[PDB]
């Protein structure tokens, strides 16, 4: 035994499955419209983004 004790500290994870309750009509959402924007034209394929 050297002349000193010590304290040890860890961290430990847990996969927890949760329960979310959320009451009626609290948030109010605003949904836009999908707008397609072409960006890339290659010789092989043409990509898009919505």
């Amino acid at each position: 035994h050297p002349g000193f004790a010590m304290t040890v500290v860890r961290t430990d994870e847990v996969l927890a499955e949760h329960i979310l309750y959320c009451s009626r009509a609290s948030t109010s959402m605003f949904v836009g419209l999908p707008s397609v924007v072409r960006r890339e034209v290659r010789s092989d394929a043409v990509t898009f983004e919505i």
Binding site: P34, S35, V36, V37, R38, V41, V46, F48
Partner: peptide, 16 residues
Amino acid sequence: ENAARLGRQVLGLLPP
């Protein structure tokens, strides 16, 4: 109906 609106937007941005 709303899937046909995107068909008009992709087919209007295609290369000639």
